[PDB]
């Protein structure tokens with residue numbers, strides 16, 4: 001077993017709050033905000049050795065990242081930013097920091113009851129996205 005065990009599986013989006021405002025703060029343009037905001041992604045998390053893979057699949061886009069904790073990687077986000085990302089585990093929370101163009105945003109993923117709660121923060125704006133097992 002490893003502690004990241006509790007994240008592994010297939011998850012479906014069940015609620016979202018403030019995501020349009022988060023996207024505005026990140027710099028996402030109108031059309032992508034509307035279509036991305038409509039999406040109901042599944043999140044598929046797996047682990048093989050030290051490598052964690054997170055896939056996010058929707059009618060809008062299918063994305064995939066694989067990474068080792070603490071080891072930076074380059075990521076093309078669903079909104080087409082080219083970012084430098086680092087993901088760590090802090091007290092049981094996956095903490096994903098994206099850097100680009102002198103800006104930064106942080107996405108936290110945590111298990112709470114039977115949910116996987118995703119908190120996205122850009123400056124003072126937070127969006128909370130709740131997933132449940134598929």
Ligand SMILES: COc1cccc2onc(N)c12
Nearest residue numbers: 039041056057058060061078
């Ligand atoms: C991280 O992936 C997403 C985050 C937010 C909305 C999304 O729509 N399609 C996606 N793959 C997606």
Ligand SMILES: NC(=O)c1ccccc1
Nearest residue numbers: 041043056107118120129
């Ligand atoms: N999984 C999500 O819904 C998500 C939203 C925004 C940024 C990263 C992930």
